[PDB]
Design a protein around this nucleic acid. Structure first.
Ligand SMILES: [Zn+2]
Ligand SMILES: [Zn+2]
Ligand SMILES: [Zn+2]
Lengths: 63, 63
DNA sequence: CATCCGGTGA
DNA sequence: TCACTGGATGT
Protein backbone atom coordinates (compact mmCIF):
# COMPACT_ATOMS: atom_id res chain seq x y z
CA UNK A 1 0.00 0.00 0.00
CA UNK A 2 1.78 3.09 -1.29
CA UNK A 3 0.89 6.83 -1.49
CA UNK A 4 1.38 9.07 -4.53
CA UNK A 5 3.86 12.01 -4.31
CA UNK A 6 2.28 15.46 -4.00
CA UNK A 7 1.45 17.09 -7.33
CA UNK A 8 1.99 13.85 -9.21
CA UNK A 9 -0.78 11.85 -10.84
CA UNK A 10 -0.91 8.07 -11.17
CA UNK A 11 -2.81 6.62 -14.12
CA UNK A 12 -3.86 2.98 -14.50
CA UNK A 13 -4.73 2.34 -18.14
CA UNK A 14 -6.05 -0.70 -19.96
CA UNK A 15 -5.07 -1.65 -23.47
CA UNK A 16 -7.95 -1.79 -25.90
CA UNK A 17 -6.59 -3.25 -29.14
CA UNK A 18 -3.91 -5.54 -30.48
CA UNK A 19 -2.55 -8.86 -29.38
CA UNK A 20 -2.17 -7.16 -25.98
CA UNK A 21 -5.74 -5.97 -25.39
CA UNK A 22 -6.75 -6.21 -21.74
CA UNK A 23 -3.18 -5.71 -20.53
CA UNK A 24 -2.72 -2.85 -18.04
CA UNK A 25 -0.15 -0.06 -17.99
CA UNK A 26 0.60 2.33 -15.15
CA UNK A 27 2.15 5.70 -15.82
CA UNK A 28 2.75 8.91 -13.81
CA UNK A 29 2.32 12.60 -14.64
CA UNK A 30 4.67 15.14 -13.06
CA UNK A 31 3.33 18.43 -11.62
CA UNK A 32 4.57 19.91 -14.92
CA UNK A 33 2.74 17.35 -17.06
CA UNK A 34 5.60 15.18 -18.22
CA UNK A 35 4.46 11.57 -18.57
CA UNK A 36 6.53 8.57 -17.45
CA UNK A 37 5.84 5.04 -18.70
CA UNK A 38 8.43 3.31 -16.56
CA UNK A 39 10.30 3.49 -13.27
CA UNK A 40 13.57 3.64 -15.18
CA UNK A 41 12.63 6.70 -17.31
CA UNK A 42 11.28 8.38 -14.16
CA UNK A 43 14.44 7.50 -12.20
CA UNK A 44 16.59 8.94 -15.02
CA UNK A 45 14.47 12.07 -14.71
CA UNK A 46 15.16 12.30 -10.99
CA UNK A 47 18.88 12.09 -11.75
CA UNK A 48 19.02 14.60 -14.60
CA UNK A 49 17.41 17.02 -12.18
CA UNK A 50 19.21 16.15 -8.97
CA UNK A 51 16.00 15.39 -7.09
CA UNK A 52 17.13 14.63 -3.55
CA UNK A 53 13.80 14.06 -1.84
CA UNK A 54 11.76 11.81 -4.13
CA UNK A 55 13.06 8.26 -4.65
CA UNK A 56 12.24 5.88 -7.53
CA UNK A 57 10.72 3.53 -4.94
CA UNK A 58 8.06 6.15 -4.14
CA UNK A 59 6.54 5.39 -7.53
CA UNK A 60 4.45 2.25 -7.88
CA UNK A 61 4.19 1.03 -11.47
CA UNK A 62 2.53 -2.28 -10.63
CA UNK A 63 -1.20 -3.01 -10.82
CA UNK B 1 27.72 -29.61 -34.60
CA UNK B 2 24.04 -30.64 -34.54
CA UNK B 3 22.54 -29.24 -37.79
CA UNK B 4 19.76 -26.65 -38.02
CA UNK B 5 16.39 -27.65 -39.60
CA UNK B 6 15.74 -26.31 -43.13
CA UNK B 7 14.17 -22.85 -43.21
CA UNK B 8 14.86 -22.27 -39.53
CA UNK B 9 17.41 -19.82 -38.19
CA UNK B 10 19.46 -20.22 -35.02
CA UNK B 11 20.57 -17.06 -33.23
CA UNK B 12 23.21 -16.88 -30.50
CA UNK B 13 22.82 -13.60 -28.62
CA UNK B 14 24.74 -12.00 -25.79
CA UNK B 15 23.10 -9.99 -23.00
CA UNK B 16 24.45 -6.42 -22.89
CA UNK B 17 23.04 -4.88 -19.73
CA UNK B 18 21.79 -5.86 -16.29
CA UNK B 19 22.87 -8.50 -13.74
CA UNK B 20 23.53 -11.49 -16.07
CA UNK B 21 25.25 -9.30 -18.67
CA UNK B 22 27.59 -11.20 -20.97
CA UNK B 23 25.62 -14.45 -20.83
CA UNK B 24 24.55 -16.12 -24.07
CA UNK B 25 21.06 -17.17 -25.07
CA UNK B 26 20.04 -19.09 -28.15
CA UNK B 27 16.75 -18.72 -29.91
CA UNK B 28 15.29 -20.00 -33.17
CA UNK B 29 13.27 -18.37 -35.93
CA UNK B 30 10.71 -20.46 -37.82
CA UNK B 31 10.42 -20.21 -41.63
CA UNK B 32 7.42 -17.95 -40.87
CA UNK B 33 9.37 -15.71 -38.49
CA UNK B 34 8.02 -16.83 -35.13
CA UNK B 35 10.73 -16.61 -32.48
CA UNK B 36 11.30 -19.27 -29.82
CA UNK B 37 13.43 -18.29 -26.83
CA UNK B 38 12.94 -21.59 -25.00
CA UNK B 39 12.85 -25.28 -25.83
CA UNK B 40 9.51 -25.83 -24.11
CA UNK B 41 7.85 -23.14 -26.15
CA UNK B 42 9.16 -24.61 -29.41
CA UNK B 43 8.07 -28.11 -28.40
CA UNK B 44 4.59 -26.80 -27.50
CA UNK B 45 4.55 -25.23 -30.95
CA UNK B 46 5.32 -28.58 -32.58
CA UNK B 47 2.41 -30.10 -30.69
CA UNK B 48 -0.22 -27.44 -31.35
CA UNK B 49 0.58 -27.95 -35.04
CA UNK B 50 0.97 -31.73 -35.13
CA UNK B 51 4.49 -31.58 -36.56
CA UNK B 52 5.43 -35.20 -37.17
CA UNK B 53 8.85 -34.81 -38.71
CA UNK B 54 10.73 -32.26 -36.59
CA UNK B 55 11.56 -33.28 -33.02
CA UNK B 56 12.36 -30.98 -30.06
CA UNK B 57 15.78 -32.66 -29.91
CA UNK B 58 16.62 -31.29 -33.38
CA UNK B 59 16.84 -27.86 -31.78
CA UNK B 60 19.99 -27.01 -29.87
CA UNK B 61 19.49 -24.23 -27.32
CA UNK B 62 22.89 -24.63 -25.67
CA UNK B 63 25.97 -22.52 -26.36
C1' DC C 1 6.81 -12.79 -15.76
C1' DA C 2 7.90 -7.85 -15.00
C1' DT C 3 9.71 -4.22 -17.10
C1' DC C 4 10.90 -1.53 -20.87
C1' DC C 5 10.71 1.56 -24.93
C1' DG C 6 10.90 1.86 -30.07
C1' DG C 7 7.50 1.60 -34.03
C1' DT C 8 3.48 3.16 -35.68
C1' DG C 9 0.15 6.33 -37.52
C1' DA C 10 -4.09 9.31 -36.72
C1' DT D 1 7.22 15.37 -23.37
C1' DC D 2 1.71 12.14 -28.80
C1' DA D 3 -1.21 8.01 -27.30
C1' DC D 4 -1.03 3.46 -27.78
C1' DT D 5 0.64 -0.97 -28.80
C1' DG D 6 4.34 -5.00 -30.19
C1' DG D 7 7.60 -7.63 -28.84
C1' DA D 8 12.61 -7.28 -26.96
C1' DT D 9 14.93 -7.98 -22.64
C1' DG D 10 16.59 -9.76 -18.30
C1' DT D 11 14.56 -11.53 -13.73
ZN1 LIG E 1 0.41 15.76 -0.74
ZN1 LIG F 1 32.00 -30.86 -37.04
ZN1 LIG G 1 18.37 -27.89 -45.50
Amino acid sequence: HKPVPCGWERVVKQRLSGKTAGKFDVYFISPQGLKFRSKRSLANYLLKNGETFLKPEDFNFTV
